[model samples]
Target: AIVGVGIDLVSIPDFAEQVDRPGTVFAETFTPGERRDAADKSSSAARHLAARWAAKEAVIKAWSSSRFSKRPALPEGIHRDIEVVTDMWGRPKVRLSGEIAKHLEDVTIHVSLTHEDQTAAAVAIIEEP
Candidate 1:
């Protein structure tokens, strides 16, 4: 059954401004793999970055809402902890770690990411055993 849900949206213009400092902001905000994917030629770098950021934020909300124990505040390494990767069919999937992994042990977290007209949004659903 579903235990929790979360959603987030980001503006590409603002995100692009932050990513202007690509070296710093990219390392600070995105996972290593995300950096590779977003920076690669085939990727829509700005949109992907915004969508991934939204996903991470939504995941945090979903996890916190599911926990019986108190999860600490979001951390600097959150970007890496919630890895947004693609499946074989080019579908987005999440690989998680840290508190999210431990607390969501029997729970499944579904991710949805979308971008259009310079806005990116994400949703996360937490289902428990």
Candidate 2:
């Protein structure tokens, strides 16, 4: 059965805690663009990037690079392929490029995002006609 929502949300604090050994862990966790956003070192900034990553995680599942291959478990090498940016309304949106991009050229991503006092969340749905 198809899932109602292609969903993935992550705990902002737990994301850090889950892989907080320092160094490239943060770098390895998000895209270069996302890295730039988090560079500000504010909770809101981190939350934004966290939500973006969560969105990507959901998107990765909804689609498949997994035709015998899958996205790397972490963000160091291929995370940039799934870019998360904002629309005019400041809602998180998804963009893609290179390998993953061409795969879904027919469908544009319609993503939604959220951040609360403790968590950041996202979902990636698709539209193609």
lDDT of each: 0.71, 0.62
Residue pairs with colliding backbones in model 1 are none
User: Residue by residue across 1-129, what tens digits does model 2's lDDT show?
Assistant: 232246887877766444333455355456565555555445566677777768777776555433313444533334657767777666776767766676667666677878776687887766566
lDDT per residue as tens, model 1, 1-129: 998888989887677666545574367556666565554433487677778778877876776666543656655555556677656554678887876566567878898988887788999998867
Which pairs in model 2 have colliding backbones?
none
lDDT of 1: 0.71
lDDT of 2 at 100: 61
Candidate with best TM-score: 1
Q: Estimate each model's TM-score.
A: 0.73, 0.66
Q: Once model 1 is optimally superposed onto the true structure by TM-score, how far is the C-alpha of residue 87 displaced, in angstroms?
A: 3.9
**Least well predicted 10-residue stretch by lDDT in candidate 2:** 65-74
